Amino acid sequence: SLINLKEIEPQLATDPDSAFFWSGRTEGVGGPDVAEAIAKSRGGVTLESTIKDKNIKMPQSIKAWEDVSASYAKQVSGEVRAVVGQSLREGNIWENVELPRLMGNDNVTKITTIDPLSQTEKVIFVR
C-alpha cells in the first residue's frame, strides 16, 4: 500500500451529523470541489476536505482511496448527506465502497442525497 492506514484512520472520524459524500455530475457539474462547497456551506465536511484540513498525505492510488473512503464511511454517525449526480461512473466508490458501509454502520440514522446542480434533495434511507 502507498499509505499508512492505521495511523490515518483516527483522523477520518467525523462529528455526528456532519459527514458528506459525493459521486458523479449532473450536466457536467459536480466532483469533489463542488461537493466540498455544498458540504461546508451547510456546516459539514467531505472526505477530501477532511484529508486537506487534517493534512493527511494521499496519492495503487485507487486502492489507497478505497481504503480511506471505507474508513471514513465506517466512522460517521447520525444524519449523512451525499451530493449525487445524475451521471455516475461505473465502479464508483460511493456505490461500491461507501454506501454499503453506511448501511452497515448502526450509527447512521438517515441518508439524504443532494443534486450537485439543482441541490434538490431526496431522503434515500431512514433507519
Author numbering: 252 to 310, 318 to 385
Task: Give sentences copied directly from the paper behind this entry.
Here, we identify and characterize a novel toxin domain in Pantoea ananatis that displays remarkable structural and functional conservation with the human enzyme CD38. This bacterial toxin, fused to a type VI secretion system (T6SS) PAAR domain, harbors a C-terminal ADP-ribosyl cyclase (ARC) domain that hydrolyzes NAD+ and NADP+in vitro and in vivo, leading to growth inhibition in both bacterial and eukaryotic cells. We show that this bacterial toxin, designated ARCtox, shares the catalytic residues, enzymatic activity, and overall fold of CD38, yet functions as a cytotoxic effector capable of depleting NAD+ and NADP+ in both bacteria and eukaryotic target cells, suggesting a dual role in microbial competition and host interaction. We demonstrate that the C-terminal extension of a specialized PAAR protein from P. ananatis, PANA_2924, acts as a potent cytotoxic effector, exhibiting both antibacterial and anti-eukaryotic activity through depletion of the cellular NAD+/NADP+ pool.
Crystallization of the PANA_2924 extension was, however, achieved after dissociating the immunity protein from the complex by adding urea to the affinity chromatography washing buffer, followed by refolding and SEC purification of the isolated toxin. An X-ray diffraction dataset was collected, and the structure was solved by molecular replacement using the AlphaFold3 model, followed by refinement to a resolution of 1.6 Å. PANA_2924 crystallized in the space group P212121, with two molecules per asymmetric unit. These two molecules adopt similar conformations. However, while the first chain could be modeled from residues 252 to 385, missing a flexible loop from 311 to 317, the second chain could be modeled from residues 250 to 385, missing a different flexible loop (amino acids 345–349). The structure reveals a globular fold with two lobes, consisting of a four-stranded β-sheet covered by a helical cap composed of five α-helices. A search for structural homologues using DALI showed that the PANA_2924 C-terminal extension displays a fold similar to the human protein CD38 (Z-score: 8.6). Although the overall identity of the PANA_2924-C and CD38 domains retrieved using DALI is relatively low (26.3%), the two domains are indeed structurally similar. Indeed, substitution of any of the ARCtox putative catalytic residues, W273, E299, W323, and E356, by alanines abolished ARCtox activity in E. coli. Upon incubation with ARCtox, NAD+ and NADP+ were converted into nicotinamide and ADP-ribose.
